[PDB]
Write a protein that binds this DNA or RNA. Structure first.
Ligand SMILES: [Mg+2]
Ligand SMILES: [Mg+2]
Ligand SMILES: [Mg+2]
Ligand SMILES: [Mg+2]
Ligand SMILES: [Mg+2]
Ligand SMILES: [Mg+2]
Ligand SMILES: [Mg+2]
Ligand SMILES: [Mg+2]
Ligand SMILES: [Mg+2]
Ligand SMILES: [Mg+2]
Ligand SMILES: [Mg+2]
Ligand SMILES: [Mg+2]
Ligand SMILES: [Mg+2]
Ligand SMILES: [Mg+2]
Ligand SMILES: [Mg+2]
Ligand SMILES: [Mg+2]
Ligand SMILES: [Mg+2]
Ligand SMILES: [Mg+2]
Ligand SMILES: [Mg+2]
Ligand SMILES: [Mg+2]
Ligand SMILES: [Mg+2]
Ligand SMILES: [Mg+2]
Ligand SMILES: [Zn+2]
Lengths: 115, 157, 205, 42
RNA sequence: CCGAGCCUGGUGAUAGCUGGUUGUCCAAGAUGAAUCUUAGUUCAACUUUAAAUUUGCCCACAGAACCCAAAUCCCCUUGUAAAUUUAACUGUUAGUCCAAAGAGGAACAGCUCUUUGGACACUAGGAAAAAACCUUGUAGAGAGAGUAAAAAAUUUAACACCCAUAGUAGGCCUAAAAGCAGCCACCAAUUAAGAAAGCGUUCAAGCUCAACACAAAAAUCCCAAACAUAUA
RNA sequence: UCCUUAAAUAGGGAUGGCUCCACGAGGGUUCAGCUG
RNA sequence: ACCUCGGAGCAGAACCCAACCUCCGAGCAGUACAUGCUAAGACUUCACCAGUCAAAGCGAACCUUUGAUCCAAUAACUUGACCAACGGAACAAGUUACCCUAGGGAUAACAGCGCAAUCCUAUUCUAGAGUCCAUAUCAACAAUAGGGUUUACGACCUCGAUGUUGGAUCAGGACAUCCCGAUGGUGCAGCCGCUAUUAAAGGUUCGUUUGUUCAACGAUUAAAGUCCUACGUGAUCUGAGUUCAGACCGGAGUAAUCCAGGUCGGUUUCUAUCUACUUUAAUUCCUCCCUGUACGAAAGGACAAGAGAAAUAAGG
């Protein structure tokens, strides 16, 4: 039968080679994911459809910010084949109330407070 | 259709693509490496002993003879104390340098039949060879003294 | 008794209860009789299949005729036909229950040794008729010595270790990368993409 | 040269072949998802 | 126009059966039980509307059997915004193909059953045409832009070269079977050679192992045209 | 099995059991003739 | 044969899961006579009906499957008949081709389409036969391909005027070649065969029985090929078998009726709208010459080349 797939934990254990390749430090890990839906939920199980709806990724290619916490990561693991995940980078820290209206998410994944 | 079939079942195109993508890729071994840069010892010792046992040596090309003719020639040679030998050039070429015979290198090539002896009946051997107008005598070296065919003729006479 | 023992068509006491056609007994790698036992040569099954009594007779006759009884000895590494294939009548409309037993047959999985030779004789002396018998067999088969078996195995690990493809069927299936488990069988996680139905792809890492 | 029955469903189907383009597309998706694995590992 | 006339009436007979069922626009909306029952219906499930108030789904850890696998169930968080209940209610409710686990059949069927999931009965792009495969969905106008899936690949059989003295036809039984119908030993010389590995002899005789030595075929008519090398 | 034909899945013959006189747009077989 | 209920597998791990699916079992008994009464809270065979479990309490003591309602009977408590088609018409069978209506391609037969078990063909292996001799020839057990000609299977198109088989007419096509052509081998001296490669331009008979396709038989032929074409072709024909209403024989049945059987008889419509189409270098055989020459011990008997006769086909 076709069922939900249990991903073995070893899949989500980065190696030093991966760290060099992708440029993320396991210590001080990134706080927020930028997740975009790059694949249709059609012809996918209803549970993947539901996970996408929960994460708010109904529109493709529309970035959404999520917490990099284990539960959100569990959902993202369920639907990892439909999404692109990149860390949210904050070169100038999180925006202040003054410049909350002058931010822009660069394609590199950086939220710049100047635009 | 069942999961197991007598014929090879058609794969879902996604599975086919998966197989193609995960096909084995052999490594390239750098620049093409090809394009890149006790009978033997029995013969060794036997020939080592023979080189001292013999006092006069000669060589011929007794390959043009028949089995019966070769047997008769061997009988006529065994009438005397001379003994007929053959040994690979493959192992004799090392033997020449081993026994310090530099002038003997360009004498042994192809079929070579040694005629090791200590008493010259070469007069009668040449007489026997005469009635068979072939199988010419080849150069040899008696007691470390190289003799040409003219040398053998003079020594015989 | 340095000769290959005769195999009966059907068990003396048959199975009163008809059993289903569990093709899993042909699907996948063989876990039993995968290694040599008191022999040097054998016929390796490079695919799964069902060995009928006709195949048993072919093997027995050919090997017994073409081996030296005094030096070469043979041994079956496969049980006698024990699975009834309840082939129905020679024409009838579908239904009416399940059919009756007509032939008996023994399942064989890939990697299973079928017949094992032994005695004072080298591999090339036996390659000929073992290869003929292997071709006769209903599944892919190969005349394999102990040395050749170990050589091909070591070659398989060499492939698995040296392939430059970043993408392996194991990695993709286990991680469910492209949602391919929507297309794969649960058995594919363990067959690692080397088995498809009863066919085994040795060339495929 | 006809395929018996209806194409793409029966026991005997049109042979489908994987183009280099299809292979590249699948590999691209696989790379994206390998990156997803890495970013989900922390 | 007689297996039971014709006309009128009952009569607008009855029909679980066939056909038909007329303005515009928007929205929600899809696969069990019983039944003289499987061409139908009732209940359920689903569905629609309105209403009430309060948790609903996802969900890790912990937890769920002895006998003899994929997964599932359960729920703190978390992502989310839905769920339950109340009132009213029609209609759909004995489907198709694809992937997967099985059963039956013939490990046939565009075959028949059960289960998980997907798609179709809904838009569009692609796979030649194309319900069911792949990409993709929420709707309009545009003479803008980035993309998704998306193009089949392969061509394949030469071969070393030599020459082979003799114990003896090794014996046994075998008319003789000597290497060859068969057992048993399987030594041996020259420098170097298996009392037989294959042809051929009633038996001999004549030849080679070596070693000396150096894939495909079916019926109207093949089926885009073509192209090997201009930068990824 | 015999006759019929060169050839014969045709035709004819070796209360019950038989006897077909005549008849028939009945159903079969046939000689001869006749003929598009 | 089955129809209700239950246990096991399919259905491996909450529940749930079919079948003409694979197996098994039951229509109660034994026990006691608290095996009483009441009652929180729950389960539930996917609905309902029905069916389960149960603390506390009271009362004695110190249990382990079949069925509704109505209706009857009993003073009542309670009880019964079947309802086993086991959600149960209170009580009703055969038959229809004399049939009728409403429908159904959601459902049979011919046909089409899948499939290839069966069937057919080709290779691989030599077991083996072939006096020896695998491979001149044939061939077992099997293996691998291909075909879609049989027998079957499926129920996907067509049941809102298409019977079917044979025959006639006209044929289109495949080649897996029956003849004619060209070759290799041969267990081919010649003739002859056997085998294989290539070849689809052309050709491929007439009769008796039978409705016959086939078949047997007779006589021929260079040969009387295997197939596909809706088992080609009935808006071109025929209706002999089979198929409708009549009737017998035999058989089944109480009868009505029926029958894969035997027999006699039995309506075959269409004025063509559209497409399409309506004038596209022969073949064989025999005789003769070569020549009763080659070949062959003889018997027998050629090639290749040429001439003459016919015959057919086409065109006049
Ligand atoms: Mg088609
Ligand atoms: Mg009237
Ligand atoms: Mg009405
Ligand atoms: Mg809508
Ligand atoms: Mg009833
Ligand atoms: Mg009905
Ligand atoms: Mg007649
Ligand atoms: Mg009258
Ligand atoms: Mg319930
Ligand atoms: Mg009933
Ligand atoms: Mg009932
Ligand atoms: Mg159906
Ligand atoms: Mg019509
Ligand atoms: Mg041909
Ligand atoms: Mg047909
Ligand atoms: Mg008639
Ligand atoms: Mg009648
Ligand atoms: Mg009849
Ligand atoms: Mg009649
Ligand atoms: Mg009449
Ligand atoms: Mg007509
Ligand atoms: Mg007309
Ligand atoms: Zn080079």
């Amino acid at each position: 039968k076709f069922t939900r797939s249990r991903i073995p934990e070893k899949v989500f254990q980065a190696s030093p080679e991966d760290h060099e390749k992708y440029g993320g430090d396991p210590q001080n890990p990134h706080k927020l994911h930028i997740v975009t839906r790059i694949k249709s939920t059609r012809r996918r199980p209803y549970w993947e459809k539901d996970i996408i709806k929960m994460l708010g990724l109904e529109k493709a290619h529309t970035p959404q910010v999520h917490k990099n916490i284990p539960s959100v990561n569990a959902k993202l693991k369920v639907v990892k084949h439909l999404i692109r995940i990149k860390p949210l980078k904050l070169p100038q820290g999180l925006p202040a109330e003054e410049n909350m209206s002058n931010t822009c998410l660069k394609s590199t994944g950086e939220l710049v407070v100047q635009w | 259709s069942k999961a197991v079939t007598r014929h090879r079942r058609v794969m879902h195109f996604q599975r086919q693509k998966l197989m193609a993508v995960t096909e084995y890729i052999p490594p390239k071994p750098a620049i093409h490496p090809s394009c890149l840069p006790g009978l033997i010892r029995l013969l060794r010792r036997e020939i080592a002993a023979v080189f001292q046992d013999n006092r006069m040596i000669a060589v011929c090309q007794n390959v043009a003879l028949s089995a019966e003719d070769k047997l008769l020639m061997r009988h006529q040679l065994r009438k005397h104390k001379i003994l007929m030998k053959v040994f690979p050039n493959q192992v004799l070429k090392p033997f020449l340098e081993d026994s310090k015979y530099q002038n003997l290198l360009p004498l042994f090539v192809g079929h070579n039949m040694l005629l090791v002896s200590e008493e010259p009946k070469v007069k009668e051997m040449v007489r026997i060879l005469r009635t068979v107008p072939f199988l010419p005598l080849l150069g040899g070296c008696i007691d470390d003294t190289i003799l040409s065919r003219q040398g053998f003729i003079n020594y015989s006479k | 008794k340095p000769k290959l023992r005769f195999i009966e068509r059907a068990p003396l006491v048959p199975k009163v209860r008809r059993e289903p056609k569990n093709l899993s007994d042909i699907r996948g790698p063989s876990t039993e009789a995968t290694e040599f036992t008191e022999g040097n040569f054998a016929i390796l099954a490079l695919g799964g299949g069902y060995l009928h009594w006709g195949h048993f007779e072919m093997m027995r006759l050919t090997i017994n005729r073409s081996m030296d009884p005094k030096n070469m000895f043979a041994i079956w590494r496969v049980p006698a036909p024990f699975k009834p294939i309840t082939r129905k009548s020679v024409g009838h409309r579908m239904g009416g229950g399940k059919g009756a037993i007509d032939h008996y047959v023994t399942p064989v999985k890939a990697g299973r040794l079928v017949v094992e030779m032994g005695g004072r004789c080298e591999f090339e002396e036996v390659q000929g008729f073992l290869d003929q018998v292997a071709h006769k067999l209903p599944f892919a088969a190969k005349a394999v010595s102990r040395g050749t078996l170990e050589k091909m195995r070591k070659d398989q690990e060499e492939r698995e270790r040296n392939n430059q493809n970043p993408w392996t069927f194991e990695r993709i299936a286990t991680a469910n990368m492209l949602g391919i488990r929507k297309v794969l069988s649960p058995y594919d996680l363990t067959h690692k993409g080397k088995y498809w139905g009863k066919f085994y792809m040795p060339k495929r890492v | 040269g006809r395929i018996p029955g209806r194409q793409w469903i029966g026991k005997h189907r049109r042979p489908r072949f994987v183009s280099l383009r299809a292979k590249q597309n699948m590999i691209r998706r696989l790379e994206i998802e390998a990156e997803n694995h890495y970013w989900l590992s922390m």
